[PDB]
Every structure is written in C-alpha cells, then in structure tokens.
Coordinates of C-alpha atoms in Angstrom, one line a residue:
Chain A
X898 CA -24.4 4.8 -25.0
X899 CA -21.4 3.6 -22.9
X900 CA -21.2 4.3 -19.2
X901 CA -18.2 5.2 -17.1
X902 CA -19.3 5.0 -13.4
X903 CA -18.2 3.9 -9.9
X904 CA -18.5 0.2 -9.5
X905 CA -21.1 -1.7 -7.4
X906 CA -21.4 -5.3 -6.0
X907 CA -23.3 -6.5 -9.1
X908 CA -20.2 -5.6 -11.2
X909 CA -17.8 -8.1 -9.5
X910 CA -18.5 -10.9 -11.9
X911 CA -17.7 -8.6 -14.9
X912 CA -14.6 -7.2 -13.3
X913 CA -13.3 -10.7 -12.6
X914 CA -13.7 -11.6 -16.3
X915 CA -11.6 -8.6 -17.3
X916 CA -9.0 -9.3 -14.7
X917 CA -8.7 -13.1 -14.9
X918 CA -6.9 -13.2 -18.3
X919 CA -4.5 -10.6 -16.9
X920 CA -3.8 -12.8 -13.8
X921 CA -3.0 -15.8 -16.1
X922 CA -0.7 -13.5 -18.1
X923 CA 1.3 -12.8 -14.9
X924 CA 0.3 -9.1 -14.8
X925 CA -1.9 -8.8 -11.7
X926 CA -4.5 -11.9 -8.1
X927 CA -8.0 -10.7 -6.8
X928 CA -10.5 -13.2 -5.2
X929 CA -14.2 -12.3 -5.2
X930 CA -14.1 -11.6 -1.5
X931 CA -11.1 -9.2 -2.1
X932 CA -13.0 -7.5 -4.8
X933 CA -16.1 -7.3 -2.5
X934 CA -13.9 -5.5 0.1
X935 CA -12.4 -3.0 -2.3
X936 CA -15.4 -2.4 -4.6
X937 CA -15.6 1.2 -3.6
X938 CA -12.2 1.9 -5.1
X939 CA -13.3 0.6 -8.6
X940 CA -14.6 2.4 -11.6
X941 CA -15.9 0.5 -14.7
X942 CA -17.0 1.0 -18.3
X943 CA -20.4 -0.7 -19.3
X944 CA -21.4 -1.1 -22.9
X945 CA -24.8 -2.7 -23.6
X946 CA -24.7 -4.3 -20.2
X947 CA -21.1 -5.7 -20.6
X948 CA -18.3 -4.6 -18.4
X949 CA -15.6 -3.7 -20.9
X950 CA -13.2 -1.8 -18.7
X951 CA -12.3 -1.2 -15.0
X952 CA -9.7 0.6 -13.0
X953 CA -9.0 1.0 -9.3
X954 CA -7.9 4.2 -7.3
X955 CA -6.1 3.9 -4.0
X956 CA -5.9 7.2 -2.3
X957 CA -3.0 8.3 0.0
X958 CA -4.9 11.1 1.6
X959 CA -2.2 12.9 3.7
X960 CA 0.4 12.5 0.9
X961 CA -2.2 13.8 -1.5
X962 CA -1.4 11.0 -4.0
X963 CA -3.4 8.1 -5.4
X964 CA -2.3 5.0 -7.2
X965 CA -4.3 4.0 -10.2
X966 CA -4.1 0.2 -10.5
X967 CA -5.8 -2.9 -12.0
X968 CA -6.6 -1.1 -15.3
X969 CA -8.1 -3.5 -17.8
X970 CA -9.8 -3.0 -21.2
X971 CA -11.9 -5.8 -22.7
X972 CA -9.8 -7.4 -25.5
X973 CA -12.5 -6.8 -28.1
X974 CA -12.8 -3.1 -27.1
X975 CA -9.2 -1.8 -27.4
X976 CA -8.1 1.1 -29.7
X977 CA -11.2 3.1 -28.6
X978 CA -9.5 5.5 -26.2
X979 CA -11.0 3.6 -23.3
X980 CA -7.8 3.8 -21.3
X981 CA -7.8 7.6 -21.7
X982 CA -11.5 7.7 -20.7
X983 CA -10.7 5.9 -17.4
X984 CA -7.7 8.0 -16.7
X985 CA -9.5 11.3 -17.2
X986 CA -12.3 10.1 -15.0
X987 CA -9.7 9.1 -12.4
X988 CA -7.9 12.5 -12.7
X989 CA -11.2 14.3 -12.2
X990 CA -12.3 12.2 -9.3
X991 CA -8.9 12.5 -7.4
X992 CA -8.9 16.2 -7.9
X993 CA -12.3 16.4 -6.1
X994 CA -10.9 14.4 -3.1
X995 CA -8.0 16.9 -2.5
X996 CA -5.5 14.7 -4.3
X997 CA -3.0 16.3 -6.7
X998 CA -1.0 13.3 -8.1
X999 CA -1.7 9.9 -9.6
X1000 CA 1.0 7.3 -9.9
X1001 CA 1.1 3.9 -11.5
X1002 CA 3.5 0.9 -11.2
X1003 CA 4.0 -0.4 -14.7
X1004 CA 6.2 -2.4 -17.0
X1005 CA 4.0 -1.8 -20.0
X1006 CA 3.0 1.3 -22.1
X1007 CA 5.7 3.9 -21.4
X1008 CA 5.1 5.8 -24.6
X1009 CA 1.4 6.2 -23.7
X1010 CA 2.0 7.2 -20.1
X1011 CA 4.6 9.8 -21.1
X1012 CA 2.1 11.1 -23.7
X1013 CA -0.4 11.8 -20.9
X1014 CA 2.2 13.8 -18.9
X1015 CA 3.4 11.0 -16.6
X1016 CA 7.0 11.2 -15.5
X1017 CA 9.2 8.6 -13.9
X1018 CA 10.0 8.8 -10.1
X1019 CA 12.2 6.8 -7.7
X1020 CA 11.0 4.4 -4.9
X1021 CA 11.4 7.2 -2.4
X1022 CA 8.5 9.0 -3.9
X1023 CA 6.1 6.2 -2.9
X1024 CA 3.8 6.9 0.1
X1025 CA 5.3 5.2 3.2
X1026 CA 2.6 2.6 3.3
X1027 CA 3.5 1.4 -0.2
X1028 CA 7.3 1.5 0.6
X1029 CA 7.5 -1.8 2.6
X1030 CA 6.4 -3.6 -0.7
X1031 CA 8.4 -2.0 -3.5
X1032 CA 11.6 -3.1 -1.7
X1033 CA 10.2 -6.7 -1.5
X1034 CA 13.2 -12.3 -3.2
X1035 CA 13.9 -14.2 0.1
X1036 CA 11.1 -11.9 1.4
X1037 CA 8.2 -13.3 3.5
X1038 CA 4.7 -12.1 4.3
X1039 CA 3.7 -13.0 7.8
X1040 CA 0.2 -12.7 9.4
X1041 CA -1.0 -12.6 13.0
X1042 CA -4.6 -13.3 14.2
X1043 CA -5.6 -10.8 16.8
Chain B
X344 CA 9.9 5.1 33.4
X345 CA 9.9 4.3 29.7
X346 CA 6.9 5.4 27.6
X347 CA 5.1 3.7 24.7
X348 CA 2.8 6.3 23.0
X349 CA 1.5 7.5 19.6
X350 CA 4.1 9.8 17.9
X351 CA 3.9 13.5 17.5
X352 CA 5.7 16.1 15.2
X353 CA 8.4 16.8 17.8
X354 CA 9.4 13.0 17.5
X355 CA 10.4 13.2 13.8
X356 CA 14.1 14.0 14.5
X357 CA 14.3 11.0 16.9
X358 CA 12.5 8.6 14.5
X359 CA 14.9 9.6 11.7
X360 CA 17.9 8.8 13.9
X361 CA 16.5 5.3 14.5
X362 CA 15.6 4.7 10.8
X363 CA 18.6 6.3 9.1
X364 CA 21.1 3.5 10.0
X365 CA 18.4 1.0 8.8
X366 CA 18.2 2.9 5.4
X367 CA 22.0 2.8 5.0
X368 CA 21.8 -0.9 5.8
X369 CA 19.4 -1.5 2.8
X370 CA 16.5 -2.4 5.1
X371 CA 14.0 0.5 4.6
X372 CA 13.8 5.6 2.7
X373 CA 11.7 8.2 4.7
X374 CA 12.2 11.9 4.2
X375 CA 11.2 14.3 7.0
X376 CA 8.2 15.6 4.9
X377 CA 7.2 12.0 4.4
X378 CA 7.4 11.4 8.1
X379 CA 5.4 14.6 8.7
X380 CA 2.7 13.3 6.5
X381 CA 2.4 9.8 8.1
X382 CA 3.2 10.8 11.7
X383 CA -0.2 9.7 12.9
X384 CA 0.6 6.1 11.9
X385 CA 3.7 6.0 14.2
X386 CA 4.2 4.8 17.7
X387 CA 7.5 5.3 19.6
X388 CA 9.3 4.3 22.8
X389 CA 10.9 7.2 24.8
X390 CA 13.4 6.6 27.6
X391 CA 14.7 9.6 29.5
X392 CA 13.7 11.8 26.6
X393 CA 15.4 9.6 24.0
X394 CA 13.5 7.9 21.2
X395 CA 14.6 4.3 21.5
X396 CA 12.0 2.6 19.4
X397 CA 9.3 3.2 16.7
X398 CA 6.9 1.3 14.6
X399 CA 4.3 2.2 12.0
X400 CA 0.8 0.7 11.5
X401 CA -1.0 0.9 8.1
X402 CA -4.6 0.0 8.4
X403 CA -6.6 -1.7 5.6
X404 CA -9.9 -1.0 7.1
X405 CA -12.4 -2.9 4.8
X406 CA -10.0 -5.9 4.7
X407 CA -9.7 -5.6 8.5
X408 CA -5.9 -6.0 8.2
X409 CA -3.0 -3.7 9.1
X410 CA 0.6 -3.8 8.2
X411 CA 3.2 -3.2 10.9
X412 CA 6.2 -1.6 9.2
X413 CA 9.3 0.4 9.9
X414 CA 10.0 -1.3 13.2
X415 CA 13.3 -0.1 14.8
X416 CA 14.9 -0.5 18.2
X417 CA 17.8 1.7 19.2
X418 CA 21.0 -0.3 18.9
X419 CA 21.9 0.3 22.6
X420 CA 18.5 -0.8 23.8
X421 CA 18.1 -4.3 22.3
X422 CA 17.4 -7.5 24.2
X423 CA 14.9 -5.7 26.5
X424 CA 11.7 -7.1 24.9
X425 CA 11.1 -3.7 23.2
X426 CA 10.1 -5.3 20.0
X427 CA 7.4 -7.3 21.9
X428 CA 6.3 -4.1 23.7
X429 CA 5.7 -2.4 20.3
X430 CA 3.9 -5.4 18.9
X431 CA 1.5 -5.9 21.9
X432 CA 0.7 -2.2 21.7
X433 CA 0.0 -2.5 18.0
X434 CA -2.1 -5.6 18.6
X435 CA -4.2 -3.8 21.2
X436 CA -4.5 -0.7 19.1
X437 CA -5.6 -2.5 15.9
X438 CA -8.2 -4.5 17.8
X439 CA -9.8 -1.3 19.0
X440 CA -10.1 -0.1 15.3
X441 CA -12.0 -3.2 14.2
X442 CA -8.9 -4.8 12.7
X443 CA -8.3 -8.5 13.3
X444 CA -5.0 -9.2 11.6
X445 CA -1.5 -7.7 11.5
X446 CA 0.9 -8.6 8.8
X447 CA 4.6 -7.8 8.2
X448 CA 6.9 -8.1 5.1
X449 CA 10.2 -9.3 6.4
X450 CA 13.4 -11.0 5.5
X451 CA 14.6 -11.0 9.1
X452 CA 13.6 -12.7 12.4
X453 CA 11.4 -15.6 11.3
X454 CA 12.0 -17.5 14.6
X455 CA 10.7 -14.5 16.6
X456 CA 7.7 -13.9 14.5
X457 CA 6.7 -17.5 14.5
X458 CA 7.1 -17.4 18.3
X459 CA 4.5 -14.6 18.4
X460 CA 2.0 -16.7 16.5
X461 CA 2.7 -15.2 13.0
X462 CA 2.2 -17.5 10.1
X463 CA 3.4 -17.2 6.5
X464 CA 0.9 -16.3 3.8
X465 CA 1.1 -15.9 -0.1
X466 CA 1.0 -12.6 -2.0
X467 CA -2.7 -13.1 -2.7
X468 CA -3.4 -12.5 1.0
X469 CA -2.2 -8.8 0.6
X470 CA -4.9 -6.2 0.5
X471 CA -5.4 -5.1 -3.1
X472 CA -3.8 -1.7 -2.6
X473 CA -0.6 -3.4 -1.5
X474 CA -0.7 -6.0 -4.4
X475 CA 0.5 -3.7 -7.2
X476 CA 3.8 -3.4 -5.3
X477 CA 4.6 -7.0 -4.1
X478 CA 4.6 -8.0 -7.8
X479 CA 7.0 -5.2 -8.6
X480 CA 12.8 -5.5 -12.0
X481 CA 12.1 -3.6 -15.3
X482 CA 9.2 -2.1 -13.3
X483 CA 8.7 1.7 -13.3
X484 CA 6.9 4.1 -11.1
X485 CA 5.2 6.9 -13.0
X486 CA 3.6 10.1 -11.6
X487 CA 1.1 12.6 -13.0
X488 CA 0.5 16.1 -11.8
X489 CA -3.3 16.8 -11.7

C-alpha cells in the first residue's frame, strides 16, 4: 500500500528531495540539521519505500491553533488526492491535541483551500509568536549568543 | 523599588497601554484575549504600581533559540537602561530553559543591538516554524475550523 505516518530521522533525505525543488522555486529553506531538530513536526507519505509527500504541523497550544506548513507532493504523484490525505491526517491529529483550528500561509491554491472549508483571516488572527514575522523590507534578524 | 517579574493576568491592561501606541505607530496587533493566551511568555517592569515596560519570549526548544518580541518601554521612562534590564532578564531566563540564543526581528536600534553582542543572520537561521512567515505581498492567511 501507501503509508501516511509521523516522520522519523531516516526520512530526512527523502523530505529534502521533496522540498529542495520547492526551495529553488522560491516557495520555501531547510538545512538537514534544521530538519533533524523539527522532525517530530513532520508527517510523510511513503509509496514502495519512496517519500512522495510531507507536511509539517506547528502547534500553538494555548491559542488552540496550528499552522500546516511545508506541504509537498512528489511531482510524479500529483492528482491522486495526496494533499487531501495529508490535510485530513493533520485535521485528525490536531483535534487529538486539543487544537481546533489549522491555518496556512499561502500564495497558491485558493480554490482548493476554499473547497476544504478554509476561510481568509487578517494578520491579527496569527498567534502572537507568529506576529513579529508576518509584519516583516529594511527588516533585520539579529541573534545573540547566550 | 522597581520590579522586573514574569507577567500575570492582572497586568494585561498595563501591557495593552504600553503596546497600543506602538500598534498605532505601525510597529506591532494584540487583542486582550490574545494577551490572555500568551501571558506566560511576558515579562514586565512595574514602578509604583505602573507597568512601565514589557517584553515577550518565544522559545524554540529543540532549536535552542528564543525570540524576544513585543519589547516596549513607557515613553516617560526611557533613557534609564530599562531595555537592557529586560534583555539581561531574558538572557538569564532563556539560559535556565536550555536555550543558548536569542533573536529579534527589528527595523529599529541597530547600534544598540550590536552593542549588546547581537549579530545579523539570514532568514535560513529562523526556526522552521517561523520560516513560513518571514517569506510572507499577494500572501494570504487561511484558517480551517476543525
């Protein structure tokens, strides 16, 4: 069959392959170490040992929201409802962690999202952590070693 | 004296007053309910019962980073090293939660940040959750009721 399951460390290589062409295309970038650190957030689809889909879920526990991000379907495996498969799996998983909304940040696929019952919200809806970033031009990221 | 301490629910009103003029100024917006949901992330400064400073810390546990955001000093209480007070308190607090870097997203105060040992990083440095947002124009936020 075809498996939808939470990702593990042996899946990083396969996730990277799905994501890399998205990064070149200006869509997403994730280093391997970054993926190692977040792996728990990722779900994939495996077909005959090939990773043909992934998606990440970032919970905002106290706001009871979660962002579904980094959703990729293998180019040879589109038009097989695989996006929907990941979403329904995400829906079901969020529900079981006391989360009652999923949100996405997208420039692509409005018709499809609307068709799933997604509605558009303003930046104020974003959980406070995710607010500093939506309102990003002359905007610098600064880090401090503790 | 003047107290630096983690915030509580009775501090929301006072935080809102510090933040509201920042929101009008295009800098930050936080509803009361949003602040109720995130209150645990906030630190304030209280002087004679007046909230004269606040700052939020958003931990990225597995990446061992945390974003310091929503930093406000009462307009009548500037040039009293209160920004530094909050930062050092944040530094100390992050350290004790196994976090070894603080980052900020800013358009303001480069000289000051550099002076504290902050250095500039690229968007790839951001913890994956915070990546979907930095790379935000024709970019929509969509929500789904589970």
